[PDB]
Design a protein around this ligand. Structure first.
Ligand SMILES: NCCCNCCCCCS
Ligand SMILES: NCCCNCCCCCS
Ligand SMILES: [K+]
Ligand SMILES: [K+]
Ligand code: NA
Ligand code: NA
Ligand SMILES: [Zn+2]
Ligand SMILES: [Zn+2]
Lengths: 341, 341
């Protein structure tokens, strides 16, 4: 299978992340992509290609235009306002606030943010567009008849909602890929989010859409980031009724339990009639992940890839999270081995 | 007039504030109270007394119980979770989130926060209770027949809403004072917020209540903190209809303009029939204030106090903001001179 990857991911190289009341080097750092690329090549997936660039045609169908405009100039405005650090939101539009959009940079960065750990830094927008491009080109391979492809996206996407960034995410790459598949002729597409964290951004984008089914397996939001979405009761609204399936799970969950939710999610996706599945792949479900509480082992990723591919429908694998250790690469590569085997 | 002041304000001595993407020493630091106290004594207001302690009777009528329980244990829980810095929220319940309350400390601190610049530190709860006590004792003086009193509150209160802390505020002292006056027999009370920033917390607490009228003069929230409340169109709802009056004003506003809004607010308060006015006094309207854009001069504070007192109705002055410069003390003292003159 082809691997789509842009060297322009490195334009996002933020210096700070707000974690535990401290500003620390970010977990979502350029070396993650280096580790993953090296491991997938070592596993034999060496057909690596840069994406063609893309404009905003596809992404405007899943993200708000004001949001994208804000990201395009956020860093410049932050710097012009005289702030000394990176661009980090402080005030947020929480319960019982006005729905109005501020005009200034401090107000706007909060208006457009869901989580303050994520700083905007110079090059962030450009990196996000490159990552989106990798997702688009991956989708195009699936549309053209390939049964699998891997978009090595960085920065990741699944916490970015219609008009919010956060969780290290700015453009929802998986959502853009799903939209691209619909634009190329699909009528029904599923997104299956296996990252440890709920894909709250993806859920937001498709919650009221009946053309996309969203399934997520994740740490229970009662006690895990992103904290404010991902409960099982959330099944969709309006045109999207019945097209969100959340599988929250608790501390220590191993594959023997996690795989049961996987089986069920795939049943749901099959009943929906998805023509392809965009897999939002994070490997922060690993038993050594520094910020997560699941207990998957490296061999479990092979099982996971094989099971998702036994759907018999084409897969686009889109990179999301997985942190801390170079074994994130082995784990990603193992999912691909399961898909290709 | 009597000045109520607790030395226990000093138990709030946080190390950090998130400002401009950096963790810096807080603007709202113990020296503020020292400076203000010294200046009011210098102006002849030397009848200074400590508040009696108070439990939660009064405050439970303006703040949510879950919120107060959260504040009481937040520091302990944050430390027990192993975080190394002070307690700073990251995820927030923004647009289109679940209304559910998280169980863990990271989820809860965001659930109960409106602004991430404000860290919870050891002693914060105890300090907030002492500041609340100063407000309650001030209210009791008014209830007993005094026409003026000054509660030198620290930490301040007006950004704390029903179930949210932020803007350096944890317990809404002015809201507690208003409630105490109602509990002592008043039927109608007004809160007049002259701090540069909108009292979004106070507005939240009384938005649907007809027994309290809230007026605020402030920097336009389209460009100024708190960013997400304080527009003129917000006039109240339900039983509270017509009991919020917001006067947003722009960059460079001097007393000649600000005083016209003051006059109008007092007309509204008189028409409401307030039996007393709780003045949320911030002096960050000063032309030198480091974080604000109004252009009041030190003499204007005397005019302001005199005009508010010309209402002919008893006043409780409750300390809010005012930062940076040594003149914060002179400016507060000048309001008291205007009231007492
Ligand atoms: N203490 C837990 C901090 C979690 N903060 C954000 C993690 C985002 C990963 C996205 S895949
Ligand atoms: N760049 C403006 C930072 C504003 N941050 C909060 C100020 C709170 C004052 C309360 S009286
Ligand atoms: K997930
Ligand atoms: K105000
Ligand atoms: Na949907
Ligand atoms: Na009211
Ligand atoms: Zn993740
Ligand atoms: Zn203020």
């Amino acid at each position: 299978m082809r691997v789509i990857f842009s060297e322009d991911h490195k334009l996002r190289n933020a210096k700070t992340e707000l974690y535990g009341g401290e500003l620390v080097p970010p977990f979502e750092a350029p070396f993650r992509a280096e580790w993953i690329l090296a491991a997938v090549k070592e596993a034999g997936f060496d057909d690596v290609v840069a994406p063609a660039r893309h404009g905003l045609e596809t992404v405007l169908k899943v993200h708000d235009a004001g949001y994208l405009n804000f990201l395009e100039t956020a860093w410049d405005r932050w710097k012009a306002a005289g702030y000394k650090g990176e661009a980090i939101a402080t005030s947020f539009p929480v319960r019982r606030t006005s729905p109005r959009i501020p005009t200034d940079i401090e107000g706007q960065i909060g208006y457009y943010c869901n989580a303050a750990e994520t700083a905007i830094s110079p090059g962030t927008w450009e990196a996000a567009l490159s990552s989106m491009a990798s997702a688009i080109d991956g989708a195009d391979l699936i549309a053209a008849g390939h049964k699998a492809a891997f978009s090595l996206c960085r920065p990741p996407g699944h916490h970015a909602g219609i008009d919010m960034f956060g969780g290290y995410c700015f453009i929802n790459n998986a959502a853009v890929a799903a939209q691209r598949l619909l634009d190329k002729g699909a009528k029904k597409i599923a997104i299956l989010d296996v990252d440890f964290h709920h894909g709250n951004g993806t859920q937001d984008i498709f919650y009221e859409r009946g053309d996309v089914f969203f399934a997520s397996l994740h740490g229970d939001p009662a006690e895990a980031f992103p904290h404010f979405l991902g409960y099982a009761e959330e099944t969709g609204k309006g045109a999207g009724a019945g097209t969100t399936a959340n599988y929250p799970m608790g501390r220590g969950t191993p594959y023997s339990v996690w795989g049961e939710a996987l089986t069920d999610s795939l049943k749901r996706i099959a009943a929906f009639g998805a023509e392809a599945i965009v897999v939002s792949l994070g490997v922060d479900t690993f038993e050594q992940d520094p910020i997560s509480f699941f207990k998957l082992t490296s061999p479990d990723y092979i099982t996971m890839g094989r099971t998702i591919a036994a759907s018999g429908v084409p897969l686009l694998v889109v990179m999301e999270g997985g942190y801390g250790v170079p074994e994130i690469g082995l784990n990603v590569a193992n999912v691909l081995k399961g898909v290709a085997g």
